[PDB]
């Protein structure tokens with residue numbers, strides 16, 4: 001199940017956001033670099049903070065990510081399936097991918113069992129809906145942009161290392 005924008009009380013995007021070419025062959029994991037969360041109520045708060053941060057501080061039109069995965073094993077909708085994320089700050093990457101952002105800092109600490117499980121369910125749901133190509137790669141944002149320090153999670157990316165679609 002998905003906590004939708006209207007369920008976590010998302011601000012509207014400060015401007016219109018371009019649509020994404022579907023289906024997408026690349027799915028990109030990123031750390032949110034905020035505190036993590038165990039329940040839906042605290043996760044709701046986290047997501048609202050990141051939207052506010054992304055708009056006020058980072059100067060994006062909206063929360064950067066397509067989806068956010070909380071430590072409670074829930075999926076929080078940022079821009080969603082059909083809008084273009086701003087995760088890589090690079091039009092070439094962002095126009096050909098989806099971002100799954102993991103609520104937390106994961107240089108050392110691991111994502112929870114639930115964070116990993118729902119990732120699988122989410123990738124599956126995306127293939128069924130025709131948002132993700134069956135031949136997709138799931139990969140690390142630090143691999144795509146090695147000099148960007150905001151993408152280094154490392155303990156997050158190790159958890160996916162031996163998944164089949166992982167690169």
Ligand SMILES: *[C@@H]1O[C@H](CO)[C@@H](O)[C@H](O)[C@H]1NC(C)=O
Nearest residue numbers: 036037038071072109111112
């Ligand atoms: C969140 O991170 C803390 C470390 O600050 C850890 O002890 C805790 O178990 C984590 N909780 C979840 C659900 O990820």
